[PDB]
Design an enzyme around this catalytic site. Structure first.
Site, short mmCIF file in Angstrom:
data_model
loop_
_atom_site.label_atom_id
_atom_site.label_comp_id
_atom_site.label_asym_id
_atom_site.label_seq_id
_atom_site.Cartn_x
_atom_site.Cartn_y
_atom_site.Cartn_z
N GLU A 11 0.79 -1.25 0.00
CA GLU A 11 0.00 0.00 0.00
C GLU A 11 0.82 1.30 0.00
O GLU A 11 0.31 2.32 -0.40
CB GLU A 11 -0.90 0.03 1.25
CG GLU A 11 -1.91 -1.12 1.17
CD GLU A 11 -2.99 -0.80 0.19
OE1 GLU A 11 -3.10 0.24 -0.41
OE2 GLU A 11 -3.74 -1.83 0.03
N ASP A 20 -6.55 6.68 -4.87
CA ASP A 20 -6.04 5.34 -5.03
C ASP A 20 -6.07 4.92 -6.52
O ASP A 20 -6.24 5.75 -7.41
CB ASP A 20 -6.66 4.36 -4.10
CG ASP A 20 -8.04 3.96 -4.52
OD1 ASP A 20 -8.61 4.40 -5.47
OD2 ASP A 20 -8.56 3.10 -3.74
N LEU A 32 -8.91 3.93 2.82
CA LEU A 32 -9.91 4.55 1.96
C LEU A 32 -10.75 5.56 2.76
O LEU A 32 -11.23 5.25 3.81
CB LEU A 32 -10.86 3.50 1.41
CG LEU A 32 -12.07 4.13 0.71
CD1 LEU A 32 -11.59 4.82 -0.51
CD2 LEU A 32 -13.00 3.03 0.27
N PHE A 104 -8.38 -6.56 3.21
CA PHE A 104 -7.96 -5.20 3.46
C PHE A 104 -8.15 -4.37 2.18
O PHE A 104 -8.69 -3.31 2.17
CB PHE A 104 -6.46 -5.21 3.88
CG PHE A 104 -5.94 -3.85 4.20
CD1 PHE A 104 -5.85 -3.47 5.54
CD2 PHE A 104 -5.49 -2.99 3.19
CE1 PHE A 104 -5.29 -2.25 5.92
CE2 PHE A 104 -5.00 -1.73 3.56
CZ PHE A 104 -4.90 -1.37 4.91
N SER A 117 -12.42 -19.99 -5.58
CA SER A 117 -11.04 -20.17 -5.14
C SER A 117 -11.00 -20.55 -3.68
O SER A 117 -10.08 -21.22 -3.26
CB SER A 117 -10.26 -18.86 -5.16
OG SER A 117 -10.57 -18.08 -6.24
N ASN A 132 -7.31 -20.09 -10.56
CA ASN A 132 -8.60 -19.42 -10.46
C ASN A 132 -8.47 -17.97 -9.98
O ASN A 132 -9.11 -17.06 -10.47
CB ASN A 132 -9.45 -20.13 -9.42
CG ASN A 132 -10.86 -19.68 -9.43
OD1 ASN A 132 -11.30 -18.77 -8.73
ND2 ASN A 132 -11.59 -20.25 -10.36
#
Ligand SMILES: [Cl-]
Ligand SMILES: [Cl-]
Length: 162
Positions: A11, A20, A32, A104, A117, A132
């Protein structure tokens, strides 16, 4: 390595409001602020989160503060989720870290949308799950990060981060 360092790699750290990869106003280590197009609303959401008049800038310690809270909330989000908890519980520590990273970034919601998955994961069919997971908007949008998280999941090692 651990979840904190891992996410700090993926990040980054920005002490000023930024947009972002989806164009959303963010700050700190991937925190965010809002999906609205207004910086004002953003500035407003920031002040509410920090508890002061930030003017769109926070210090490093504050960034780390949001970061702790957000990691804690992702884990707790996973544990409260009926579909995900069992998948998380079945895995070793490294792979759990990969799952936290995904939540996250994408919200319980977005992740929760990888049922297939996750089922392979629970069955310990790592290569397949990896394949996948790669057929996703996620991967197409942020491929280098996606690759890092997929290898961690596939392998159960931190090699992609070394
Ligand atoms: Cl917050
Ligand atoms: Cl990327």
């Amino acid at each position: 390595m651990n979840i904190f360092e891992m996410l700090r790699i993926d990040e980054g750290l920005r002490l000023k409001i930024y947009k972002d990869t989806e164009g959303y106003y963010t700050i700190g280590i991937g925190h965010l602020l809002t999906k609205s197009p207004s910086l004002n609303a953003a500035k407003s959401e920031l002040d509410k989160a920090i508890g002061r008049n930030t003017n769109g800038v926070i210090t490093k310690d504050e960034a780390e503060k949001l970061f702790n809270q957000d990691v804690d909330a992702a884990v707790r989000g996973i544990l409260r989720n009926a579909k995900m908890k069992p998948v998380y519980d079945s895995m070793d520590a490294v792979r759990r870290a990969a799952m936290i990273n995904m939540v996250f970034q994408m919200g319980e919601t977005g992740v929760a949308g990888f049922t297939n998955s996750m089922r392979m994961m629970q069955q310990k069919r790592w290569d397949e799950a990896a394949v996948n997971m790669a057929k996703s908007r996620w991967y197409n949008q942020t491929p280098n990060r996606a690759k890092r998280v997929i290898t961690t999941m596939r392998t159960g090692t931190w090699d992609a981060y070394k």
